[PDB]
């Protein structure tokens, strides 16, 4: 029907994204999270050393 | 969380807005003259 | 009521929420969901200060960060079983094209003004050859609207 | 120094501190941030010198 | 010339003007800091907020949090086609 | 026909986004980055 094939394909596209794009976006988020975490931790422990 | 900082678009984005107003007016006129619909 | 208001309602409800709700409590750490903006905005600013480099970078960079997302969000209605990005009509690009071109001519006319006749000839082709170069500069300015419009 | 370190060894909430509360802790943070974007420039000298900008992925 | 107080001149200037500025920034920074991640304020629920603090929350941030919008808009559009077509 | 039904009704968001995001959206990232710069100094 007019609005049926796209409806059935929506879950297929979503599963296709979940196959790669879900873990890919997870890895991209985690990498930046750890990078900013280290960037703030180094500044913190370096300000601690400056106070020292 | 949410604030409203002083974003200058009044004296910065005035020209584009004025041009867009002229465009909307031209569209209104063409809604009656050029397209006649 | 009206269907156009319902069409624009998705934008009116997403634009404020994706930044006032997707973030946890407006925290500086950059949430896992908030990593999306944390990656997008910086690349946006890279081009913004880049392509508009100079003192003209700060003139409208916020306008760029604004205008970029409007069309992208409006066209996001494409994968639904009855999907409609502006009801298959979408006269909106007409609004953003020629008006922006006239705004460029104004930036040449409001700030640059009478020097507006000193840009169409980038390199040479003086009075012995200026009209031919202007004949394609005019086409370029005219079609820059259609290049981003439709 | 001793008290500031005592307010450092366990009093640097680097994860769950409110972002805008930095302008509360730093009185010029709010003014300059309003000042920084106000004149029109949306960039600062090495605002992310130790951070990444990243593409979509 | 004769006796003086070479060390006692720490009155006229404290050691480390740049370290003093850094430490003064440090005092304001560390003092005006939360005890341990204080002031969270995560939960919220009022008509739409019950979805905002739940579906736009970063505990998951997976693909289904955006896909709820697609499912809902599909529910709306199917009725739209039914009332339209 | 249907010309004066989505022109202004669509460009309203375009006009409003300038006041909306600039004090609302980019303010968040700008203040966050500036504050992180403060911690960097």
Swiss-Prot record, chain A:
UniProt subcellular location: Mitochondrion; Mitochondrion inner membrane
Function: Mitochondrial membrane ATP synthase (F(1)F(0) ATP synthase or Complex V) produces ATP from ADP in the presence of a proton gradient across the membrane which is generated by electron transport complexes of the respiratory chain. F-type ATPases consist of two structural domains, F(1) - containing the extramembraneous catalytic core, and F(0) - containing the membrane proton channel, linked together by a central stalk and a peripheral stalk. During catalysis, ATP synthesis in the catalytic domain of F(1) is coupled via a rotary mechanism of the central stalk subunits to proton translocation.
Other comments on record: Present with 12900 molecules/cell in log phase SD medium.
Description of how the protein assembles with itself and partners: F-type ATPases have 2 components, CF(1) - the catalytic core - and CF(0) - the membrane proton channel. In yeast, the dimeric form of ATP synthase consists of 17 polypeptides: alpha, beta, gamma, delta, epsilon, 4 (B), 5 (OSCP), 6 (A), 8, 9 (C), d, E (Tim11), f, g, h, i/j and k.
Similarity field: Belongs to the eukaryotic ATPase B chain family.
Protein name: ATP synthase subunit 4, mitochondrial
Organism: Saccharomyces cerevisiae (strain ATCC 204508 / S288c)
UniProtKB/Swiss-Prot annotation, chain D:
GO biological process: proton motive force-driven ATP synthesis
Molecular function in Gene Ontology: proton transmembrane transporter activity
Keyword tRNA-binding attributed: no
Keyword list, A-Z: Acetylation, ATP synthesis, CF(0), Hydrogen ion transport, Ion transport, Membrane, Mitochondrion, Mitochondrion inner membrane, Transport
The keyword DNA repair belongs to this UniProt entry's keyword annotation: no
Predominant cellular place of this UniProt entry's protein: mitochondrion
Annotated Gene Ontology cellular component terms: mitochondrial inner membrane; mitochondrion; proton-transporting ATP synthase complex
Subcellular location: Mitochondrion; Mitochondrion inner membrane
Family: Belongs to the ATPase d subunit family.
Function: Mitochondrial membrane ATP synthase (F(1)F(0) ATP synthase or Complex V) produces ATP from ADP in the presence of a proton gradient across the membrane which is generated by electron transport complexes of the respiratory chain. F-type ATPases consist of two structural domains, F(1) - containing the extramembraneous catalytic core, and F(0) - containing the membrane proton channel, linked together by a central stalk and a peripheral stalk. During catalysis, ATP synthesis in the catalytic domain of F(1) is coupled via a rotary mechanism of the central stalk subunits to proton translocation.
Subunit and interaction comment: F-type ATPases have 2 components, CF(1) - the catalytic core - and CF(0) - the membrane proton channel. In yeast, the dimeric form of ATP synthase consists of 17 polypeptides: alpha, beta, gamma, delta, epsilon, 4 (B), 5 (OSCP), 6 (A), 8, 9 (C), d, E (Tim11), f, g, h, i/j and k.
Note: Present with 6820 molecules/cell in log phase SD medium.
Protein name: ATP synthase subunit d, mitochondrial
From Swiss-Prot, chain E:
Keywords for this protein: ATP synthesis, CF(0), Hydrogen ion transport, Ion transport, Membrane, Mitochondrion, Mitochondrion inner membrane, Transit peptide, Transport
UniProt keyword annotation of Cell membrane present: no
GO cellular component terms given for this protein: mitochondrial inner membrane; mitochondrion; proton-transporting ATP synthase complex
Gene Ontology terms: biological process: proton motive force-driven ATP synthesis; proton transmembrane transport
Locations listed in the record: Mitochondrion; Mitochondrion inner membrane
Disulfide bonds: none
Subunit structure, interactors included: F-type ATPases have 2 components, CF(1) - the catalytic core - and CF(0) - the membrane proton channel. In yeast, the dimeric form of ATP synthase consists of 17 polypeptides: alpha, beta, gamma, delta, epsilon, 4 (B), 5 (OSCP), 6 (A), 8, 9 (C), d, E (Tim11), f, g, h, i/j and k.
UniProt function note: Mitochondrial membrane ATP synthase (F(1)F(0) ATP synthase or Complex V) produces ATP from ADP in the presence of a proton gradient across the membrane which is generated by electron transport complexes of the respiratory chain. F-type ATPases consist of two structural domains, F(1) - containing the extramembraneous catalytic core and F(0) - containing the membrane proton channel, linked together by a central stalk and a peripheral stalk. During catalysis, ATP synthesis in the catalytic domain of F(1) is coupled via a rotary mechanism of the central stalk subunits to proton translocation.
Family: Belongs to the ATPase F chain family.
Other notes: Present with 14600 molecules/cell in log phase SD medium.
Protein name: ATP synthase subunit f, mitochondrial
Species whose genome carries this gene: Saccharomyces cerevisiae (strain ATCC 204508 / S288c)
Full-sequence portion shown in this chain: 7 to 91 of 101
């Amino acid at each position: 029907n007019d609005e049926s094939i796209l409806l059935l394909t929506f879950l297929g596209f979503t599963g296709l994204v979940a196959k790669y794009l879900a873990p890919a976006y997870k890895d991209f988020a985690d990498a930046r999270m750890k990078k900013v975490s280290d960037v703030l931790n180094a500044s913190r422990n370096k300000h601690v050393e400056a106070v020292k | 969380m949410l604030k409203r900082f002083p974003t200058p678009i009044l004296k910065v984005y005035w020209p584009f807005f004025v041009a867009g107003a002229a465009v909307y007016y031209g569209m209104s006129k063409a809604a009656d003259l050029s397209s006649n619909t | 009521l009206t269907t156009f208001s319902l069409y624009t309602i998705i934008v009116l409800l997403v634009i404020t929420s994706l930044y006032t709700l997707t973030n946890n409590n407006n925290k500086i750490i950059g949430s896992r969901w908030l990593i999306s903006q944390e990656a997008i905005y910086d690349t946006i600013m890279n081009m913004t200060k880049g392509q508009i480099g100079g003192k003209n970078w700060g003139l409208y960079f916020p306008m760029i960060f604004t205008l970029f997302m409007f069309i992208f969000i409006a066209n996001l209605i494409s994968m639904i079983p009855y999907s409609f990005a502006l009801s298959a009509h979408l006269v909106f690009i007409i609004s953003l094209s020629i008006v922006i071109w006239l705004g460029n001519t104004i930036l040449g006319l409001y700030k640059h003004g009478w020097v507006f006749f000193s840009l169409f000839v980038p390199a040479g082709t003086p009075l012995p050859l200026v009209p031919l170069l202007v004949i394609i500069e005019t086409l370029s300015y005219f079609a820059r609207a259609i290049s981003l419009g439709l | 120094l001793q008290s500031t370190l005592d307010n450092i060894q366990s009093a640097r909430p680097f994860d769950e501190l409110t972002v805008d509360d930095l302008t509360k802790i730093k009185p010029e943070i709010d003014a300059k941030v309003e000042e920084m974007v106000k004149k029109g420039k949306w960039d600062v000298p090495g605002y992310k010198d130790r951070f990444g900008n990243l593409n979509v992925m | 010339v004769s006796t003086l107080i070479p060390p006692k001149v720490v009155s006229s200037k404290n050691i480390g003007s740049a370290p003093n500025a850094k430490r003064i920034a440090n005092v304001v920074h560390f003092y005006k800091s939360l005890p341990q991640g204080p002031a969270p304020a995560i939960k919220a629920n009022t008509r739409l907020a019950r979805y905002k603090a739940k579906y736009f929350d970063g505990d998951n941030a997976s693909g289904k949090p955006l896909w709820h919008f697609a499912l809902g808009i599909i529910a709306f559009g199917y009725s739209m086609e039914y009332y339209f077509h | 026909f249907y010309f004066m039904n989505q022109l202004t009704y669509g460009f309203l968001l375009m006009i409003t986004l300038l006041i909306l995001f600039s004090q609302f959206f980019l303010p968040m990232i700008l203040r966050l980055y500036v504050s992180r710069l403060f911690i960097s100094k």
